[PDB]
Amino acid sequence: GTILLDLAPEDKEYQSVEEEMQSTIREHRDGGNAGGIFNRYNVIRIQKVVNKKLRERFCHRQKEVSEENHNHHNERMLFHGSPFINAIIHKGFDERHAYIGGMFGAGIYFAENSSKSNQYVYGIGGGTGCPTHKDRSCYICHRQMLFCRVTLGKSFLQFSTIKMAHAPPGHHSVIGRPSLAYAEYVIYRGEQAYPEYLITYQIMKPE
C-alpha cells in the first residue's frame, strides 16, 4: 500500500515546501471568511507520500501526454484542498468522485496559492468548518492539505465560468485566470496528479 515518510525540519525539502506554502498566501475578497483569517501557517508536520502503483500510473500517463504535446508534459507543483485527503493518499485522485456541479465541471481543482486550497479543506466555501467546533476559522484543529505534482500538458486558458466533463479536445487541463481573483488549475483525470507531499498544519491568529 501507501508509505508516509516523515521529513525533518532540517531536511532542505521540508523548508522548500514550507516556503512555498507560507509565501503563496494572499488575502481574499471574502473577509477571510471561508478559509479563515490569518497571515501565516503553523506547520505541524510534512510527510512525503510513496505509493508504487500510484507512481506507475502517474509516470505512464505523463508519457502519453508528452507525446500528445511535443515532448513536454508540463508538470507543476500545486496545492490541493478538500475533505478527502485521507482517501486520496491511499487511492489517488479519482475523477469518478468529481461531478458536473464544480466551478469548471467534473474536474479535480488545484491552486498555485496555499491560501486558495485552504478555503476548500472543510468543503466548498468552508462547509460547516471543522468537525468539532463548526468554525471556518479554527485556530486549533489540525488541517491538512496536499502539495502535488500535476501534469498539465497543454492548458486551455479559460476566463469566464464553463462546466465541462473532460479536458477540451487537444488539451489536457483547464486554467481559469483573472480580470476571477487568483489562478485555478483543473485536470479531468486523476492520474494527472500525484500527491507528493502531505502537510499538516494550523492557521495562526494575528494578534
Kindly give, in sequence order, each residue whose CB lies less than 8 Å from that of residue 106, ignoring residues fewer than 6 positions away. 95, 98, 99, 100, 164, 165, 166, 188
Residue 159 touches ligand K56, criterion: CB under 6 A: no
- The answer to whether 138 is a known ligand-binding residue is yes
Q: Is 146 left (phi over 0), alpha (psi -120 to 50) or beta?
A: beta
91 binds, among Zn ion, ligand K56, none (CB under 5 to 8 A by kind): ligand K56
Joined together, the cell numbers standing for residue 147 give 502539495
124 binds, among Zn ion, ligand K56, none (CB under 5 to 8 A by kind): ligand K56
Closest residue by beta carbon to ligand K56: 97
Q: How far is the CB of 206 from ligand K56 (least distance, A)?
A: 25
Query: What span, in angstroms and rounded, lies between the C-alpha atoms of 61 and 75?
Result: 12
Nearer to ligand K56, 39 or 165 (CB): 165
130 binds, among ligand K56, Zn ion, none (CB under 5 to 8 A by kind): Zn ion
| CA distances in angstroms from 182 to 39, 135, 149, listed in the order given | 17, 24, 19
Residue 141 touches Zn ion, criterion: CB under 5 A: yes
Dihedral, CA of residue 24, residue 117, residue 8 and residue 38, to nearest 10: 60
| CA distances in angstroms from 203 to 101, 114, 141, 178, listed in the order given | 29, 11, 9, 26
Name which of residues 66 to 85 contact ligand K56 (CB under 6 A): 82, 84
Q: Is 170 left (phi over 0), alpha (psi -120 to 50) or beta?
A: left
Nearer to Zn ion, 132 or 160 (CB): 132
104 to 133: interface string for ligand K56, x by CB under 6 A: ----xx----------x--xx---------
- The answer to whether 141 is a known ligand-binding residue is yes
Selected from 53, 63, 72, 133, the binder of Zn ion by CB under 5 A is 133
Nearer to ligand K56, 11 or 94 (CB): 94
> Where do contacts with Zn ion occur on this chain (CB under 5 A)?
130, 132-133, 138, 141
